[PDB]
Amino acid sequence: HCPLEDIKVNPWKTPQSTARVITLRVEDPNEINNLLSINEIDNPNYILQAIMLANAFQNALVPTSTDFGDALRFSMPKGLEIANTITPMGAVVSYVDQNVTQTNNQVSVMINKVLEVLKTVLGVALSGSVIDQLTAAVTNTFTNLNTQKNEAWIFWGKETANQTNYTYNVLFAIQNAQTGGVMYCVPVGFEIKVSAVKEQVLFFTIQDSASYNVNIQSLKFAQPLVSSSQYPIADLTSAINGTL
Amino acid sequence: HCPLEDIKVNPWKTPQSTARVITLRVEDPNEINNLLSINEIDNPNYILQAIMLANAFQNALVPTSTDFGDALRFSMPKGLEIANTITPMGAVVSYVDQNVTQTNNQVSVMINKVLEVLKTVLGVALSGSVIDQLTAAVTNTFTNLNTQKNEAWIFWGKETANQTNYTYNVLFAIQNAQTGGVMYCVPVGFEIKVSAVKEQVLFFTIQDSASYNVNIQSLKFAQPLVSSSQYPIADLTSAINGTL
Ligand code: NA
Ligand code: NA
Structure with a gap:
C-alpha cells in the first residue's frame, strides 16, 4: 500500500535464529540418568552418539561428602577414568576442578563467573556456537529452580537456617561447523x-x-563422529533407556 | 557408623523424579519450524510421531495484524483446518481462543491465569502428568526472555515507550499412562x-x-499411537528437518 523504501541495513542487528528446539522428558526410563542433556547438533544423525556419551558419563557421578549432604555430582577425576573406557576411543582435551566464590553480589555476577570457567573449557570458537544454551544452562543452575527442584539432575544437601547445599549436573554435546x-x-x-x-x-x-x-568439575571430551542414519530407531530408544 | 533408626515416613514429601530430560537444538534445519517442541513421553518409540505433529501444526501459524507488528502466531481457526488434513486421521478434542488481562499485578499472577486456561484445555489427569513442564513453559513465556529473544518461536512486534508486543509459539506432545x-x-x-x-x-x-x-489460541488434538521402532533413524532425521 505504501512506497517501497530503499534498504537501511544495521549490521549489528542480530538475525532471528532458524534453529529448531525440541525438549524430551522421558518418563520412567529403564535406567536412571542424572545428567541434564543439552545438545547442540546440526546433523540429527549424531543424536544417538550424543545420548550414548551422556549414558557413559552417568558412571562418573559420585556422592558428595557426608558434611555436604546426600547428593550426586559429576566428578572430574572419575570422569577421566571413565573417559578411557569409552568406545569408540577418544581424547580428553581439557578438564577443570575449580572453586568460585562471591560475597553479597547479585546472582547475575555468579552466573558470569561460572560462565567464564565453562567458556575457558569450551574455547572461543566452541563457546560462540552454543552461547545461548550455555548462558541459559548456567542461569538455570542458580535460578528457575522451583520447577526443577524434584528433577533427576539436581540434589539437595544440608539445609541450615543460613545456608543451602545443592548439586547440579548438566552435560553439553556439541556437533557443528x-x-x-x-x-x-x-x-x-x-x-x-x-x-x-x-x-x-x-x-x-x-x-x-x-x-x-x-x-x-568438568572436562572436554572429543569423540570422532559416528553417523547412525542406517540403524533402526529401536537403537535410539535403547540408548535413551540406557539399555543399548 | 551410627545406629540404624526406625523409618519415619512423611507421606507428603515429594520423591525425586527418575525422568530423563534431553534438549536438542538443531542448527540450520532444512525446513524452519517456529514452534518450541516440548515432549512428555514414556516410550521413545513415539518421538518421531511427536515431531511429525509439530511439523504439521507449523502450517497453522499465521501473521498478526499490521497494527500488532511483524510476528507469527499459532492460529486456532487455521489449526482446525490443518487438523483435518493430518494423517493418520485424528480428532480435535478441544480448542480455545481467549483473552487474558491483568493490571499492575505481579508476573506470577499472569502465569497462573494462563496456566488456568491451558489446564482447562489439557484436563485434570493430563495436566497432572505434565505439570512441571507446563508451569516452566508458561513461566518461560513471560520471563527468561533474554536468552530466548532471538529464537525461532518468539517474534517481536511493535515496540513503543509504554508497551511491547510479542508472540510466543509452544507445542506440547503428551504420551503416557x-x-x-x-x-x-x-x-x-x-x-x-x-x-x-x-x-x-x-x-x-x-x-x-x-x-x-x-x-x-490453542487446541487439543488426539492422534492414535504409531510406533516407529522398526523404521531407520534416517526417517527421524528427516522428520526433524521437516523433509519426511
Ligand atoms: Na546471550
Ligand atoms: Na510445579
Missing part, C-alpha cells in the same frame, strides 16, 4: 553452597543478592 | 501486549509487576 569430524562432550558437576534458605533459593532470580561458595 | 492408545498434541499461540519497554521485558522476573493484555 566448529567441531568438524568430532563431537565434543562437556559434563559439568556443580557443588553449590549459597547463603540463603531453600525456600528463598527456590525463587532466586538474577536480581537477587547472595554469597556463593561453588566447586565446578 | 494418562493418554493410553493416543498421543495428545496441544499447540499454543500467544499474542502478548505488556506495559513495559523491551529492555525491561527481556529481564522480567516473576517478582516484577506489569499490566498484560494477552490472547491465547
Whole structure:
C-alpha cells in the first residue's frame, strides 16, 4: 500500500535464529540418568552418539561428602577414568576442578563467573556456537529452580537456617561447523553452597543478592563422529533407556 | 557408623523424579519450524510421531495484524483446518481462543491465569502428568526472555515507550499412562501486549509487576499411537528437518 523504501541495513542487528528446539522428558526410563542433556547438533544423525556419551558419563557421578549432604555430582577425576573406557576411543582435551566464590553480589555476577570457567573449557570458537544454551544452562543452575527442584539432575544437601547445599549436573554435546569430524562432550558437576534458605533459593532470580561458595568439575571430551542414519530407531530408544 | 533408626515416613514429601530430560537444538534445519517442541513421553518409540505433529501444526501459524507488528502466531481457526488434513486421521478434542488481562499485578499472577486456561484445555489427569513442564513453559513465556529473544518461536512486534508486543509459539506432545492408545498434541499461540519497554521485558522476573493484555489460541488434538521402532533413524532425521 505504501512506497517501497530503499534498504537501511544495521549490521549489528542480530538475525532471528532458524534453529529448531525440541525438549524430551522421558518418563520412567529403564535406567536412571542424572545428567541434564543439552545438545547442540546440526546433523540429527549424531543424536544417538550424543545420548550414548551422556549414558557413559552417568558412571562418573559420585556422592558428595557426608558434611555436604546426600547428593550426586559429576566428578572430574572419575570422569577421566571413565573417559578411557569409552568406545569408540577418544581424547580428553581439557578438564577443570575449580572453586568460585562471591560475597553479597547479585546472582547475575555468579552466573558470569561460572560462565567464564565453562567458556575457558569450551574455547572461543566452541563457546560462540552454543552461547545461548550455555548462558541459559548456567542461569538455570542458580535460578528457575522451583520447577526443577524434584528433577533427576539436581540434589539437595544440608539445609541450615543460613545456608543451602545443592548439586547440579548438566552435560553439553556439541556437533557443528566448529567441531568438524568430532563431537565434543562437556559434563559439568556443580557443588553449590549459597547463603540463603531453600525456600528463598527456590525463587532466586538474577536480581537477587547472595554469597556463593561453588566447586565446578568438568572436562572436554572429543569423540570422532559416528553417523547412525542406517540403524533402526529401536537403537535410539535403547540408548535413551540406557539399555543399548 | 551410627545406629540404624526406625523409618519415619512423611507421606507428603515429594520423591525425586527418575525422568530423563534431553534438549536438542538443531542448527540450520532444512525446513524452519517456529514452534518450541516440548515432549512428555514414556516410550521413545513415539518421538518421531511427536515431531511429525509439530511439523504439521507449523502450517497453522499465521501473521498478526499490521497494527500488532511483524510476528507469527499459532492460529486456532487455521489449526482446525490443518487438523483435518493430518494423517493418520485424528480428532480435535478441544480448542480455545481467549483473552487474558491483568493490571499492575505481579508476573506470577499472569502465569497462573494462563496456566488456568491451558489446564482447562489439557484436563485434570493430563495436566497432572505434565505439570512441571507446563508451569516452566508458561513461566518461560513471560520471563527468561533474554536468552530466548532471538529464537525461532518468539517474534517481536511493535515496540513503543509504554508497551511491547510479542508472540510466543509452544507445542506440547503428551504420551503416557494418562493418554493410553493416543498421543495428545496441544499447540499454543500467544499474542502478548505488556506495559513495559523491551529492555525491561527481556529481564522480567516473576517478582516484577506489569499490566498484560494477552490472547491465547490453542487446541487439543488426539492422534492414535504409531510406533516407529522398526523404521531407520534416517526417517527421524528427516522428520526433524521437516523433509519426511
Ligand atoms: Na546471550
Ligand atoms: Na510445579
